[PDB]
Design a protein around this motif. Structure first.
Motif, PDB file in Angstrom:
ATOM      1  N   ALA A  46      11.585  14.442  16.276  1.00 12.41           N
ATOM      2  CA  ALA A  46      10.158  15.206  16.591  1.00 12.41           C
ATOM      3  C   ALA A  46      10.198  16.028  15.545  1.00 12.41           C
ATOM      4  CB  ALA A  46      10.372  15.773  17.950  1.00 12.41           C
ATOM      5  N   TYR A  47      10.777  16.748  14.536  1.00 12.93           N
ATOM      6  CA  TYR A  47      10.892  17.659  13.787  1.00 12.93           C
ATOM      7  C   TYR A  47      11.060  17.189  12.467  1.00 12.93           C
ATOM      8  CZ  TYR A  47      10.066  20.707  17.775  1.00 12.93           C
ATOM      9  OH  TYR A  47       9.637  21.401  18.909  1.00 12.93           O
ATOM     10  N   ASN A  48      11.222  16.018  12.214  1.00 15.68           N
ATOM     11  CA  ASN A  48      11.427  15.458  10.745  1.00 15.68           C
ATOM     12  C   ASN A  48      10.636  15.532   9.829  1.00 15.68           C
ATOM     13  OD1 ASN A  48      13.998  15.047  11.867  1.00 15.68           O
ATOM     14  ND2 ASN A  48      14.157  12.665  11.507  1.00 15.68           N
ATOM     15  N   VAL A  49      10.904  15.811   8.655  1.00 17.15           N
ATOM     16  CA  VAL A  49       9.838  15.922   7.544  1.00 17.15           C
ATOM     17  C   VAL A  49       9.736  14.572   6.673  1.00 17.15           C
ATOM     18  CG1 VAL A  49       9.522  16.739   5.263  1.00 17.15           C
ATOM     19  CG2 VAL A  49       9.658  18.374   7.268  1.00 17.15           C
ATOM     20  N   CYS A  50       8.618  13.975   6.501  1.00 19.63           N
ATOM     21  CA  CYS A  50       8.593  12.780   5.785  1.00 19.63           C
ATOM     22  C   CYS A  50       7.350  12.350   5.227  1.00 19.63           C
ATOM     23  CB  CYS A  50       8.719  11.426   6.741  1.00 19.63           C
ATOM     24  SG  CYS A  50       8.613   9.898   6.165  1.00 19.63           S
ATOM     25  N   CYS A  51       7.445  12.360   3.634  1.00 16.31           N
ATOM     26  CA  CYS A  51       6.303  12.413   3.052  1.00 16.31           C
ATOM     27  C   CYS A  51       6.671  11.675   1.590  1.00 16.31           C
ATOM     28  CB  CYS A  51       5.933  13.773   2.911  1.00 16.31           C
ATOM     29  SG  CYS A  51       7.436  14.862   2.480  1.00 16.31           S
ATOM     30  N   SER A  52       5.381  11.521   0.829  1.00 16.06           N
ATOM     31  CA  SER A  52       5.380  10.758  -0.239  1.00 16.06           C
ATOM     32  C   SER A  52       4.702  11.700  -1.660  1.00 16.06           C
ATOM     33  CB  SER A  52       4.703   9.397  -0.293  1.00 16.06           C
ATOM     34  OG  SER A  52       5.549   8.752   0.792  1.00 16.06           O
TER      35      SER A  52
END
Ligand SMILES: [Zn+2]
Ligand SMILES: [Zn+2]
Lengths: 58, 58
Positions: A46-52
């Motif tokens: 719910a609070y994970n950071v995922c980005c590119s």
């Protein structure tokens, strides 16, 4: 793509790993710790950071 | 493929991640612990385990 690999350390991701992530894991007795890494699939939560984008994972 | 996602949990890896790993992460003052996960690319490290069969990362 460049990502954090710890609180302060930084690296260029290997081929096929096109995302940065920052996710917490349990340590002990209610303490938690952040894991910073390049990945191909982000851990879901719910609070994970995922980005590119470069150094987007904090 | 199935991997340990911690010392006590397991998961079926998302399609696109065909390896299991156990890799070392530093905590503080020389202490460390392991992160268990599915991956497409294993983290480099002399204490790490990178494998390709069910639950192989412990
Ligand atoms: Zn205790
Ligand atoms: Zn200290």
């Amino acid at each position: 793509l460049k990502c954090y690999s710890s609180r302060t350390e930084t690296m260029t991701c290997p081929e096929g790993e096109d995302k940065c992530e920052k996710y917490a894991v349990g340590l002990m007795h209610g303490s938690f710790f952040f894991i910073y890494t390049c990945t191909s699939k982000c851990h879901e939560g719910a609070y994970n950071v995922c980005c590119s984008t470069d150094l987007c994972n904090k």
